[PDB]
């Protein structure tokens, strides 16, 4: 009856001037996404995404706004321990020069991605859906397993 619960830690990090709402601008909080895969035996699988919304770092803006591959290198790759399976998603403004005109997202040749925020009333639900879409295109969809 093994109750497997696969969780993919994704650090969704928002740049300044990328996701303000009408009354509140930003908050460093956490959301979860569960996508329990149906199985026909006692064992069961739950795919979990732990989105880690937070404000962009002081040096992250410096690294950003240069050109997608350039900034991706400029993040220093942040060498860390047991980073496999984790994702990092940088959220940018609509009129950012990184992705040319209308590409709402971007997937690097690594555990990193860059997505575009759309700056309106919700700004967190549509962004959350884009994050889960890019994450499942980047790690742990239903067809990988």
Short mmCIF file of N, CA, C and O in Angstrom, two decimals:
data_model
loop_
_atom_site.label_atom_id
_atom_site.label_comp_id
_atom_site.label_asym_id
_atom_site.label_seq_id
_atom_site.Cartn_x
_atom_site.Cartn_y
_atom_site.Cartn_z
N UNK A 1 0.81 -1.21 0.00
CA UNK A 1 0.00 0.00 0.00
C UNK A 1 0.85 1.26 0.00
O UNK A 1 0.44 2.28 0.58
N UNK A 2 2.03 1.22 -0.62
CA UNK A 2 2.96 2.34 -0.59
C UNK A 2 2.31 3.62 -1.08
O UNK A 2 1.81 3.68 -2.21
N UNK A 3 2.31 4.63 -0.22
CA UNK A 3 1.66 5.91 -0.50
C UNK A 3 2.73 6.89 -0.98
O UNK A 3 3.16 7.78 -0.24
N UNK A 4 3.16 6.72 -2.22
CA UNK A 4 4.18 7.60 -2.78
C UNK A 4 3.63 9.00 -2.98
O UNK A 4 2.50 9.17 -3.45
N UNK A 5 4.42 10.00 -2.61
CA UNK A 5 4.06 11.41 -2.78
C UNK A 5 5.28 12.13 -3.35
O UNK A 5 6.14 12.60 -2.60
N UNK A 6 5.35 12.21 -4.67
CA UNK A 6 6.44 12.90 -5.34
C UNK A 6 6.20 14.40 -5.27
O UNK A 6 5.15 14.88 -5.72
N UNK A 7 7.16 15.15 -4.73
CA UNK A 7 7.05 16.59 -4.65
C UNK A 7 8.22 17.23 -5.39
O UNK A 7 9.38 16.87 -5.16
N UNK A 8 7.91 18.17 -6.28
CA UNK A 8 8.90 18.89 -7.07
C UNK A 8 9.01 20.30 -6.49
O UNK A 8 8.09 21.11 -6.64
N UNK A 9 10.11 20.63 -5.81
CA UNK A 9 10.27 21.99 -5.28
C UNK A 9 10.60 22.96 -6.41
O UNK A 9 11.63 22.84 -7.07
N UNK A 10 9.70 23.92 -6.63
CA UNK A 10 9.89 24.97 -7.62
C UNK A 10 9.96 26.30 -6.89
O UNK A 10 9.09 26.62 -6.07
N UNK A 11 11.01 27.06 -7.16
CA UNK A 11 11.19 28.39 -6.60
C UNK A 11 10.73 29.38 -7.65
O UNK A 11 11.43 29.65 -8.63
N UNK A 12 9.52 29.91 -7.47
CA UNK A 12 8.97 30.92 -8.35
C UNK A 12 9.35 32.27 -7.76
O UNK A 12 8.92 32.62 -6.67
N UNK A 13 10.17 33.02 -8.49
CA UNK A 13 10.76 34.24 -7.97
C UNK A 13 10.35 35.40 -8.87
O UNK A 13 10.52 35.35 -10.09
N UNK A 14 9.76 36.43 -8.26
CA UNK A 14 9.15 37.54 -8.99
C UNK A 14 10.06 38.75 -8.97
O UNK A 14 10.51 39.18 -7.90
N UNK A 15 10.32 39.31 -10.15
CA UNK A 15 11.10 40.53 -10.23
C UNK A 15 10.24 41.74 -9.85
O UNK A 15 9.00 41.69 -9.88
N UNK A 16 10.91 42.82 -9.48
CA UNK A 16 10.22 44.08 -9.23
C UNK A 16 9.53 44.56 -10.49
O UNK A 16 10.04 44.40 -11.61
N UNK A 17 8.34 45.16 -10.31
CA UNK A 17 7.53 45.64 -11.42
C UNK A 17 7.15 44.51 -12.37
O UNK A 17 7.22 44.65 -13.59
N UNK A 18 6.76 43.37 -11.81
CA UNK A 18 6.34 42.23 -12.60
C UNK A 18 5.01 41.63 -12.19
O UNK A 18 4.40 40.92 -13.00
N UNK A 19 4.53 41.88 -10.97
CA UNK A 19 3.28 41.27 -10.52
C UNK A 19 2.61 42.07 -9.41
O UNK A 19 2.38 41.54 -8.30
N UNK A 20 2.23 43.33 -9.63
CA UNK A 20 1.41 44.02 -8.63
C UNK A 20 -0.07 43.84 -8.90
O UNK A 20 -0.54 43.84 -10.04
N UNK A 21 -0.83 43.69 -7.81
CA UNK A 21 -2.28 43.66 -7.90
C UNK A 21 -2.83 45.06 -7.62
O UNK A 21 -2.09 46.03 -7.44
N UNK A 22 -4.16 45.17 -7.59
CA UNK A 22 -4.79 46.48 -7.48
C UNK A 22 -4.45 47.16 -6.15
O UNK A 22 -4.09 48.34 -6.13
N UNK A 23 -4.53 46.42 -5.05
CA UNK A 23 -4.29 46.97 -3.72
C UNK A 23 -2.99 46.51 -3.10
O UNK A 23 -2.32 47.29 -2.41
N UNK A 24 -2.60 45.25 -3.32
CA UNK A 24 -1.39 44.69 -2.75
C UNK A 24 -0.42 44.34 -3.87
O UNK A 24 -0.82 43.84 -4.92
N UNK A 25 0.87 44.59 -3.63
CA UNK A 25 1.87 44.37 -4.66
C UNK A 25 2.42 42.94 -4.64
O UNK A 25 2.24 42.19 -5.60
N UNK A 26 3.05 42.54 -3.54
CA UNK A 26 3.78 41.28 -3.51
C UNK A 26 3.78 40.69 -2.10
O UNK A 26 3.60 41.41 -1.11
N UNK A 27 3.99 39.37 -2.03
CA UNK A 27 4.09 38.62 -0.77
C UNK A 27 5.01 37.43 -0.99
O UNK A 27 4.92 36.77 -2.03
N UNK A 28 5.91 37.13 -0.04
CA UNK A 28 6.75 35.91 -0.09
C UNK A 28 6.14 34.68 0.58
O UNK A 28 6.42 34.34 1.73
N UNK A 29 5.27 33.98 -0.14
CA UNK A 29 4.50 32.87 0.42
C UNK A 29 4.69 31.60 -0.42
O UNK A 29 5.54 31.54 -1.30
N UNK A 30 3.88 30.58 -0.12
CA UNK A 30 4.01 29.28 -0.75
C UNK A 30 2.63 28.74 -1.12
O UNK A 30 1.68 28.87 -0.35
N UNK A 31 2.53 28.15 -2.32
CA UNK A 31 1.32 27.45 -2.74
C UNK A 31 1.71 26.04 -3.16
O UNK A 31 2.87 25.74 -3.41
N UNK A 32 0.70 25.17 -3.22
CA UNK A 32 0.92 23.78 -3.60
C UNK A 32 -0.05 23.38 -4.70
O UNK A 32 -1.15 23.93 -4.82
N UNK A 33 0.38 22.42 -5.51
CA UNK A 33 -0.43 21.86 -6.58
C UNK A 33 -0.33 20.34 -6.51
O UNK A 33 0.78 19.80 -6.61
N UNK A 34 -1.46 19.67 -6.34
CA UNK A 34 -1.50 18.21 -6.23
C UNK A 34 -2.22 17.63 -7.44
O UNK A 34 -3.27 18.14 -7.84
N UNK A 35 -1.64 16.58 -8.02
CA UNK A 35 -2.16 15.99 -9.25
C UNK A 35 -2.16 14.47 -9.16
O UNK A 35 -1.60 13.78 -10.01
N UNK A 36 -2.76 13.93 -8.09
CA UNK A 36 -2.79 12.50 -7.82
C UNK A 36 -3.12 11.68 -9.06
O UNK A 36 -4.19 11.82 -9.65
N UNK A 37 -2.19 10.82 -9.46
CA UNK A 37 -2.36 9.99 -10.65
C UNK A 37 -3.16 8.75 -10.27
O UNK A 37 -2.82 8.07 -9.29
N UNK A 38 -4.22 8.41 -11.00
CA UNK A 38 -5.03 7.24 -10.64
C UNK A 38 -4.30 5.95 -10.98
O UNK A 38 -3.74 5.80 -12.06
N UNK A 39 -4.31 5.01 -10.03
CA UNK A 39 -3.72 3.70 -10.21
C UNK A 39 -4.76 2.63 -9.91
O UNK A 39 -5.73 2.87 -9.19
N UNK A 40 -4.55 1.44 -10.47
CA UNK A 40 -5.50 0.35 -10.32
C UNK A 40 -5.11 -0.64 -9.24
O UNK A 40 -5.82 -1.64 -9.05
N UNK A 41 -4.02 -0.40 -8.52
CA UNK A 41 -3.60 -1.27 -7.43
C UNK A 41 -3.57 -0.48 -6.12
O UNK A 41 -3.98 0.68 -6.07
N UNK A 42 -3.08 -1.13 -5.06
CA UNK A 42 -3.08 -0.50 -3.74
C UNK A 42 -2.15 0.70 -3.70
O UNK A 42 -2.45 1.71 -3.06
N UNK A 43 -1.00 0.60 -4.37
CA UNK A 43 -0.05 1.69 -4.43
C UNK A 43 -0.62 2.87 -5.20
O UNK A 43 -1.38 2.71 -6.16
N UNK A 44 -0.27 4.08 -4.76
CA UNK A 44 -0.82 5.30 -5.35
C UNK A 44 0.25 6.38 -5.39
O UNK A 44 1.17 6.40 -4.57
N UNK A 45 0.11 7.28 -6.36
CA UNK A 45 1.09 8.33 -6.64
C UNK A 45 0.40 9.68 -6.59
O UNK A 45 -0.67 9.86 -7.18
N UNK A 46 1.03 10.64 -5.91
CA UNK A 46 0.57 12.02 -5.90
C UNK A 46 1.73 12.91 -6.32
O UNK A 46 2.76 12.96 -5.64
N UNK A 47 1.56 13.61 -7.43
CA UNK A 47 2.57 14.56 -7.89
C UNK A 47 2.29 15.92 -7.25
O UNK A 47 1.18 16.45 -7.36
N UNK A 48 3.30 16.47 -6.58
CA UNK A 48 3.14 17.69 -5.80
C UNK A 48 4.14 18.74 -6.28
O UNK A 48 5.32 18.44 -6.45
N UNK A 49 3.65 19.95 -6.52
CA UNK A 49 4.49 21.10 -6.84
C UNK A 49 4.39 22.09 -5.69
O UNK A 49 3.28 22.49 -5.31
N UNK A 50 5.53 22.47 -5.13
CA UNK A 50 5.60 23.44 -4.04
C UNK A 50 6.15 24.74 -4.59
O UNK A 50 7.37 24.94 -4.64
N UNK A 51 5.26 25.63 -5.01
CA UNK A 51 5.68 26.93 -5.53
C UNK A 51 6.00 27.86 -4.37
O UNK A 51 5.24 27.95 -3.40
N UNK A 52 7.12 28.58 -4.50
CA UNK A 52 7.76 29.28 -3.39
C UNK A 52 7.84 30.78 -3.63
O UNK A 52 8.93 31.36 -3.55
N UNK A 53 6.71 31.40 -3.94
CA UNK A 53 6.68 32.78 -4.43
C UNK A 53 7.44 33.72 -3.51
O UNK A 53 7.24 33.70 -2.29
N UNK A 54 8.31 34.55 -4.09
CA UNK A 54 9.11 35.47 -3.29
C UNK A 54 9.57 36.63 -4.16
O UNK A 54 9.54 36.57 -5.39
N UNK A 55 10.01 37.71 -3.51
CA UNK A 55 10.49 38.91 -4.24
C UNK A 55 11.87 38.62 -4.83
O UNK A 55 12.63 37.85 -4.20
N UNK A 56 12.18 39.20 -5.99
CA UNK A 56 13.49 39.00 -6.64
C UNK A 56 14.59 39.62 -5.78
O UNK A 56 14.34 40.66 -5.15
N UNK A 57 15.78 39.01 -5.78
CA UNK A 57 16.92 39.51 -4.96
C UNK A 57 17.50 40.78 -5.59
O UNK A 57 17.31 40.99 -6.81
N UNK A 58 18.22 41.57 -4.79
CA UNK A 58 18.83 42.85 -5.25
C UNK A 58 19.74 42.62 -6.46
O UNK A 58 19.70 43.44 -7.39
N UNK A 59 20.52 41.53 -6.46
CA UNK A 59 21.45 41.21 -7.57
C UNK A 59 20.71 40.47 -8.70
O UNK A 59 21.33 40.29 -9.76
N UNK A 60 19.46 40.06 -8.48
CA UNK A 60 18.76 39.33 -9.53
C UNK A 60 18.31 40.27 -10.64
O UNK A 60 18.32 39.89 -11.81
N UNK A 61 17.93 41.50 -10.28
CA UNK A 61 17.61 42.50 -11.30
C UNK A 61 18.84 42.88 -12.11
O UNK A 61 18.75 43.05 -13.33
N UNK A 62 19.99 43.02 -11.45
CA UNK A 62 21.24 43.29 -12.16
C UNK A 62 21.53 42.20 -13.17
O UNK A 62 21.87 42.47 -14.33
N UNK A 63 21.39 40.94 -12.75
CA UNK A 63 21.62 39.82 -13.67
C UNK A 63 20.61 39.81 -14.80
O UNK A 63 20.95 39.52 -15.95
N UNK A 64 19.35 40.14 -14.50
CA UNK A 64 18.30 40.11 -15.50
C UNK A 64 18.38 41.35 -16.40
O UNK A 64 19.17 42.27 -16.16
N UNK A 65 17.57 41.34 -17.46
CA UNK A 65 17.44 42.45 -18.41
C UNK A 65 18.68 42.61 -19.28
O UNK A 65 19.16 43.72 -19.50
N UNK A 66 19.21 41.50 -19.79
CA UNK A 66 20.37 41.55 -20.67
C UNK A 66 20.17 40.72 -21.93
O UNK A 66 20.75 41.03 -22.98
N UNK A 67 19.37 39.67 -21.84
CA UNK A 67 19.22 38.70 -22.92
C UNK A 67 19.15 37.31 -22.32
O UNK A 67 20.00 36.96 -21.51
N UNK A 68 18.18 36.49 -22.76
CA UNK A 68 17.75 35.34 -21.97
C UNK A 68 18.91 34.43 -21.57
O UNK A 68 19.09 34.12 -20.39
N UNK A 69 19.71 34.01 -22.54
CA UNK A 69 20.83 33.12 -22.21
C UNK A 69 21.87 33.85 -21.37
O UNK A 69 22.48 33.27 -20.46
N UNK A 70 22.08 35.14 -21.64
CA UNK A 70 23.06 35.92 -20.89
C UNK A 70 22.68 36.01 -19.42
O UNK A 70 23.50 35.74 -18.54
N UNK A 71 21.44 36.38 -19.13
CA UNK A 71 20.99 36.45 -17.74
C UNK A 71 20.98 35.07 -17.10
O UNK A 71 21.35 34.93 -15.93
N UNK A 72 20.58 34.04 -17.85
CA UNK A 72 20.56 32.69 -17.30
C UNK A 72 21.95 32.28 -16.84
O UNK A 72 22.11 31.66 -15.77
N UNK A 73 22.98 32.60 -17.62
CA UNK A 73 24.35 32.41 -17.15
C UNK A 73 24.65 33.32 -15.96
O UNK A 73 25.29 32.90 -14.99
N UNK A 74 24.19 34.57 -16.02
CA UNK A 74 24.51 35.58 -15.02
C UNK A 74 23.89 35.30 -13.66
O UNK A 74 24.24 35.98 -12.69
N UNK A 75 22.97 34.34 -13.57
CA UNK A 75 22.45 33.92 -12.27
C UNK A 75 23.46 33.10 -11.48
O UNK A 75 23.12 32.59 -10.41
N UNK A 76 24.68 32.94 -12.01
CA UNK A 76 25.77 32.20 -11.38
C UNK A 76 25.44 30.72 -11.21
O UNK A 76 26.22 29.97 -10.61
N UNK A 77 24.27 30.31 -11.70
CA UNK A 77 23.80 28.93 -11.65
C UNK A 77 23.53 28.47 -10.22
O UNK A 77 23.00 27.38 -10.00
N UNK A 78 23.88 29.32 -9.25
CA UNK A 78 23.75 29.08 -7.81
C UNK A 78 24.06 27.64 -7.45
O UNK A 78 23.15 26.88 -7.09
N UNK A 79 25.32 27.21 -7.55
CA UNK A 79 25.66 25.82 -7.19
C UNK A 79 25.24 25.50 -5.77
O UNK A 79 25.56 26.22 -4.83
N UNK A 80 24.49 24.41 -5.63
CA UNK A 80 23.90 24.03 -4.35
C UNK A 80 23.86 22.51 -4.25
O UNK A 80 24.23 21.79 -5.18
N UNK A 81 23.40 22.03 -3.10
CA UNK A 81 23.40 20.61 -2.78
C UNK A 81 22.03 20.01 -3.09
O UNK A 81 21.00 20.56 -2.68
N UNK A 82 22.03 18.87 -3.79
CA UNK A 82 20.81 18.12 -4.08
C UNK A 82 19.79 18.98 -4.82
O UNK A 82 18.60 19.01 -4.48
N UNK A 83 20.26 19.70 -5.84
CA UNK A 83 19.39 20.56 -6.63
C UNK A 83 18.62 19.80 -7.71
O UNK A 83 17.77 20.40 -8.36
N UNK A 84 18.91 18.52 -7.90
CA UNK A 84 18.23 17.75 -8.94
C UNK A 84 16.76 17.56 -8.58
O UNK A 84 16.41 17.29 -7.43
N UNK A 85 15.90 17.70 -9.58
CA UNK A 85 14.47 17.64 -9.38
C UNK A 85 13.82 18.96 -9.05
O UNK A 85 12.59 19.07 -9.13
N UNK A 86 14.60 19.96 -8.68
CA UNK A 86 14.08 21.28 -8.36
C UNK A 86 14.00 22.13 -9.61
O UNK A 86 14.74 21.94 -10.57
N UNK A 87 13.07 23.09 -9.59
CA UNK A 87 12.92 24.04 -10.69
C UNK A 87 13.04 25.46 -10.15
O UNK A 87 12.79 25.72 -8.98
N UNK A 88 13.44 26.37 -11.04
CA UNK A 88 13.49 27.79 -10.73
C UNK A 88 12.82 28.55 -11.86
O UNK A 88 13.15 28.33 -13.03
N UNK A 89 11.87 29.42 -11.52
CA UNK A 89 11.13 30.16 -12.53
C UNK A 89 11.19 31.64 -12.18
O UNK A 89 10.63 32.07 -11.17
N UNK A 90 11.83 32.42 -13.04
CA UNK A 90 11.90 33.87 -12.88
C UNK A 90 10.74 34.51 -13.63
O UNK A 90 10.54 34.24 -14.82
N UNK A 91 9.98 35.36 -12.94
CA UNK A 91 8.80 36.00 -13.52
C UNK A 91 9.19 37.42 -13.89
O UNK A 91 9.76 38.16 -13.08
N UNK A 92 8.90 37.81 -15.13
CA UNK A 92 9.26 39.12 -15.64
C UNK A 92 8.01 39.88 -16.05
O UNK A 92 6.91 39.32 -16.12
N UNK A 93 8.17 41.17 -16.34
CA UNK A 93 7.06 42.01 -16.74
C UNK A 93 6.64 41.71 -18.18
O UNK A 93 7.31 40.99 -18.92
N UNK A 94 5.50 42.29 -18.57
CA UNK A 94 4.97 42.08 -19.92
C UNK A 94 5.93 42.60 -20.98
O UNK A 94 6.27 41.89 -21.93
N UNK A 95 6.37 43.84 -20.83
CA UNK A 95 7.19 44.50 -21.84
C UNK A 95 8.68 44.24 -21.65
O UNK A 95 9.50 45.04 -22.10
N UNK A 96 9.04 43.15 -20.98
CA UNK A 96 10.45 42.81 -20.84
C UNK A 96 11.04 42.44 -22.20
O UNK A 96 10.38 41.81 -23.03
N UNK A 97 12.29 42.83 -22.41
CA UNK A 97 12.99 42.56 -23.66
C UNK A 97 13.55 41.15 -23.74
O UNK A 97 14.10 40.78 -24.78
N UNK A 98 13.45 40.37 -22.66
CA UNK A 98 14.05 39.04 -22.64
C UNK A 98 13.43 38.14 -23.70
O UNK A 98 14.11 37.71 -24.64
N UNK A 99 12.15 37.85 -23.57
CA UNK A 99 11.44 37.08 -24.59
C UNK A 99 10.82 38.02 -25.60
O UNK A 99 10.16 38.99 -25.21
N UNK A 100 10.99 37.77 -26.91
CA UNK A 100 10.98 38.86 -27.89
C UNK A 100 9.74 39.75 -27.90
O UNK A 100 9.84 40.94 -27.60
N UNK A 101 8.59 39.20 -28.24
CA UNK A 101 7.39 40.05 -28.21
C UNK A 101 6.20 39.39 -27.54
O UNK A 101 5.46 40.07 -26.82
N UNK A 102 6.00 38.09 -27.73
CA UNK A 102 4.78 37.44 -27.28
C UNK A 102 5.01 36.06 -26.69
O UNK A 102 4.03 35.40 -26.33
N UNK A 103 6.25 35.60 -26.58
CA UNK A 103 6.52 34.32 -25.94
C UNK A 103 6.31 34.47 -24.44
O UNK A 103 7.13 35.08 -23.75
N UNK A 104 5.21 33.92 -23.94
CA UNK A 104 4.85 34.12 -22.54
C UNK A 104 5.78 33.40 -21.58
O UNK A 104 5.74 33.68 -20.38
N UNK A 105 6.62 32.49 -22.07
CA UNK A 105 7.47 31.71 -21.19
C UNK A 105 8.71 31.26 -21.95
O UNK A 105 8.90 31.58 -23.12
N UNK A 106 9.57 30.54 -21.24
CA UNK A 106 10.90 30.16 -21.70
C UNK A 106 11.45 29.07 -20.80
O UNK A 106 11.34 29.17 -19.58
N UNK A 107 12.09 28.07 -21.41
CA UNK A 107 12.65 26.93 -20.70
C UNK A 107 14.13 26.83 -21.07
O UNK A 107 14.46 26.60 -22.24
N UNK A 108 15.02 27.00 -20.09
CA UNK A 108 16.43 26.94 -20.36
C UNK A 108 16.92 25.51 -20.47
O UNK A 108 16.19 24.54 -20.27
N UNK A 109 18.21 25.37 -20.80
CA UNK A 109 18.79 24.03 -20.88
C UNK A 109 19.25 23.54 -19.53
O UNK A 109 20.31 22.91 -19.40
N UNK A 110 18.44 23.80 -18.51
CA UNK A 110 18.79 23.53 -17.12
C UNK A 110 17.49 23.50 -16.33
O UNK A 110 16.41 23.35 -16.90
N UNK A 111 17.59 23.65 -15.01
CA UNK A 111 16.42 23.61 -14.15
C UNK A 111 15.79 24.99 -14.00
O UNK A 111 15.14 25.27 -12.99
N UNK A 112 15.98 25.86 -14.99
CA UNK A 112 15.51 27.23 -14.91
C UNK A 112 14.56 27.57 -16.06
O UNK A 112 14.65 27.02 -17.16
N UNK A 113 13.65 28.49 -15.77
CA UNK A 113 12.66 28.95 -16.72
C UNK A 113 12.35 30.41 -16.44
O UNK A 113 12.58 30.90 -15.34
N UNK A 114 11.86 31.11 -17.46
CA UNK A 114 11.50 32.52 -17.34
C UNK A 114 10.11 32.71 -17.92
O UNK A 114 9.86 32.37 -19.08
N UNK A 115 9.20 33.27 -17.12
CA UNK A 115 7.82 33.44 -17.54
C UNK A 115 7.45 34.91 -17.39
O UNK A 115 8.12 35.68 -16.70
N UNK A 116 6.36 35.30 -18.05
CA UNK A 116 5.94 36.69 -18.16
C UNK A 116 4.72 36.93 -17.29
O UNK A 116 3.71 36.23 -17.41
N UNK A 117 4.80 37.94 -16.41
CA UNK A 117 3.66 38.34 -15.61
C UNK A 117 2.83 39.42 -16.30
O UNK A 117 3.36 40.24 -17.04
N UNK A 118 1.52 39.41 -16.03
CA UNK A 118 0.58 40.20 -16.82
C UNK A 118 -0.12 41.30 -16.03
O UNK A 118 -0.99 41.97 -16.58
N UNK A 119 0.22 41.50 -14.75
CA UNK A 119 0.01 42.78 -14.08
C UNK A 119 -1.46 43.23 -14.12
O UNK A 119 -1.81 44.21 -14.78
N UNK A 120 -2.31 42.51 -13.41
CA UNK A 120 -3.71 42.92 -13.35
C UNK A 120 -4.29 42.52 -12.00
O UNK A 120 -3.55 42.29 -11.03
N UNK A 121 -5.62 42.45 -11.94
CA UNK A 121 -6.34 42.19 -10.69
C UNK A 121 -5.87 40.92 -10.01
O UNK A 121 -5.52 40.92 -8.83
N UNK A 122 -5.85 39.80 -10.75
CA UNK A 122 -5.48 38.53 -10.13
C UNK A 122 -3.97 38.40 -10.01
O UNK A 122 -3.42 38.35 -8.90
N UNK A 123 -3.28 38.31 -11.15
CA UNK A 123 -1.82 38.36 -11.24
C UNK A 123 -1.15 37.19 -10.53
O UNK A 123 0.06 37.00 -10.65
N UNK A 124 -1.93 36.37 -9.83
CA UNK A 124 -1.40 35.24 -9.07
C UNK A 124 -2.05 33.94 -9.51
O UNK A 124 -1.42 32.89 -9.46
N UNK A 125 -3.30 34.01 -9.96
CA UNK A 125 -3.96 32.79 -10.42
C UNK A 125 -3.57 32.45 -11.85
O UNK A 125 -3.24 31.30 -12.15
N UNK A 126 -3.58 33.44 -12.74
CA UNK A 126 -3.10 33.21 -14.10
C UNK A 126 -1.61 32.90 -14.09
O UNK A 126 -1.14 32.01 -14.81
N UNK A 127 -0.85 33.61 -13.25
CA UNK A 127 0.57 33.31 -13.12
C UNK A 127 0.78 31.92 -12.54
O UNK A 127 1.67 31.19 -12.97
N UNK A 128 -0.05 31.53 -11.57
CA UNK A 128 0.07 30.18 -11.02
C UNK A 128 -0.21 29.11 -12.06
O UNK A 128 0.46 28.08 -12.10
N UNK A 129 -1.20 29.35 -12.92
CA UNK A 129 -1.47 28.40 -14.00
C UNK A 129 -0.32 28.34 -14.99
O UNK A 129 0.05 27.26 -15.46
N UNK A 130 0.26 29.50 -15.34
CA UNK A 130 1.43 29.47 -16.22
C UNK A 130 2.60 28.74 -15.58
O UNK A 130 3.32 28.00 -16.26
N UNK A 131 2.81 28.94 -14.28
CA UNK A 131 3.90 28.26 -13.59
C UNK A 131 3.68 26.76 -13.60
O UNK A 131 4.60 25.99 -13.85
N UNK A 132 2.46 26.31 -13.29
CA UNK A 132 2.23 24.87 -13.27
C UNK A 132 2.37 24.30 -14.67
O UNK A 132 2.88 23.19 -14.85
N UNK A 133 1.95 25.05 -15.70
CA UNK A 133 2.10 24.58 -17.07
C UNK A 133 3.57 24.42 -17.44
O UNK A 133 3.97 23.37 -17.97
N UNK A 134 4.38 25.43 -17.15
CA UNK A 134 5.80 25.36 -17.48
C UNK A 134 6.50 24.29 -16.65
O UNK A 134 7.38 23.58 -17.15
N UNK A 135 6.11 24.14 -15.39
CA UNK A 135 6.71 23.13 -14.54
C UNK A 135 6.41 21.73 -15.05
O UNK A 135 7.30 20.88 -15.14
N UNK A 136 5.15 21.47 -15.40
CA UNK A 136 4.80 20.14 -15.89
C UNK A 136 5.39 19.88 -17.27
O UNK A 136 5.64 18.73 -17.62
N UNK A 137 5.62 20.94 -18.05
CA UNK A 137 6.40 20.77 -19.27
C UNK A 137 7.88 20.59 -18.99
O UNK A 137 8.62 20.13 -19.87
N UNK A 138 8.33 20.93 -17.78
CA UNK A 138 9.74 20.82 -17.41
C UNK A 138 10.04 19.65 -16.49
O UNK A 138 11.17 19.17 -16.48
N UNK A 139 9.06 19.18 -15.72
CA UNK A 139 9.32 18.09 -14.80
C UNK A 139 8.01 17.52 -14.29
O UNK A 139 7.10 18.27 -13.92
N UNK A 140 7.93 16.19 -14.25
CA UNK A 140 6.89 15.45 -13.54
C UNK A 140 5.49 15.81 -14.06
O UNK A 140 4.66 16.38 -13.36
N UNK A 141 5.26 15.45 -15.32
CA UNK A 141 3.91 15.39 -15.83
C UNK A 141 3.35 13.99 -15.59
O UNK A 141 3.95 13.17 -14.89
N UNK A 142 2.17 13.71 -16.16
CA UNK A 142 1.58 12.39 -15.97
C UNK A 142 2.20 11.35 -16.89
O UNK A 142 2.16 10.16 -16.58
N UNK A 143 2.77 11.78 -18.01
CA UNK A 143 3.34 10.85 -18.98
C UNK A 143 4.79 10.50 -18.71
O UNK A 143 5.28 9.51 -19.25
N UNK A 144 5.49 11.28 -17.88
CA UNK A 144 6.85 10.91 -17.49
C UNK A 144 6.84 9.60 -16.72
O UNK A 144 7.70 8.74 -16.93
N UNK A 145 5.87 9.43 -15.84
CA UNK A 145 5.75 8.22 -15.04
C UNK A 145 4.87 7.16 -15.69
O UNK A 145 4.65 6.11 -15.09
#
